[PDB]
Structure 1
Amino acid sequence: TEFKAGSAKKGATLFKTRCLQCHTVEKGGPHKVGPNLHGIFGRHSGQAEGYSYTDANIKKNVLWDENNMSEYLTNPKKYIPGTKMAFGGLKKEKDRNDLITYLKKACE
């Protein structure tokens, strides 16, 4: 795949430091600043029930996979103009591989 593979332990520390303040992962986890991310892979954007998305996120209507995730996490406002996710972006490839690797298993 275009997405290689990274460290799941490193990804975990990235998520807790840079993602956890807005996102929960486990099943039944509460919506916070951002939506719960369980089952995010294999789901179209803006379709988690209970969370109020921007029109931009919903209209984007992309099927989340390892690749378009990487693109989105690099620069969220560029991939989805008008999104309300206030994030600096993962500017390092390895960090993106590491986090997406962790995120895949964590949101099973």
Structure 2
Amino acid sequence: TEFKAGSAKKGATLFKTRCLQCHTVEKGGPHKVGPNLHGIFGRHSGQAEGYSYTDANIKKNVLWDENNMSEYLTNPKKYIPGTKMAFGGLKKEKDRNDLITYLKKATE
């Protein structure tokens, strides 16, 4: 119990400001730099078909829930050294919370 739900609305704007550049959340939404994330929760890293995920991703083989997703979010390259994810992360717990709640919601 190390993840508390923040604001959906809050999350929706970091997502825009911080993940839209390379990602879509919507089912039937496109793969871009990074892959579309619809249905990310419960799935293991590297399973979006039509996306050329680095070796690193695949082998990591992380299960996607709110928690894993918060450390990863703290420092990706650190959670998965190898990852072509060019993102330093999100330093604050609160901001993390917010977006995941956001992610929680839309990728559904």
For 1:77 and 1:94, how far apart are their aligned partners in 2?
A: 21
**Residue 88 of structure 1, CA deviation:** 1.9
Aligned length: 108
Instruction: Report the equivalent of 1:70.
Output: 70
| Fraction of identical pairs, as percent | 99
**Residue 3 of structure 1, CA deviation:** 1.2
For 1:23 and 1:5, how far apart are their aligned partners in 2?
A: 22
**Residue 54 of structure 1, CA deviation:** 0.3
**Residue 2 of structure 1, CA deviation:** 2.2
What CA deviation, in whole Å up to 9, does each residue of 1:62-105 have, x standing for no partner?
A: 11110010000110011000100000210011000000000011
* Unaligned residue ranges in structure 2 (runs of 5+): none
What CA deviation, in whole Å up to 9, does each residue of 1:9-41 have, x standing for no partner?
A: 010000000000100011111110000000000
Instruction: Report the equivalent of 1:20.
Output: 20
Instruction: Report the equivalent of 1:32.
Output: 32
* Unaligned residue ranges in structure 1 (runs of 5+): none
| Secondary structure, aligned partner of 2:16 | helix
- The alignment status of 1:55 with 2:55, answered yes or no, reads yes
For 2:17 and 2:88, how far apart are their aligned partners in 1?
A: 13
| Secondary structure, aligned partner of 1:66 | coil
Q: What is the TM-score normalised by the length of structure 1? A: 0.98
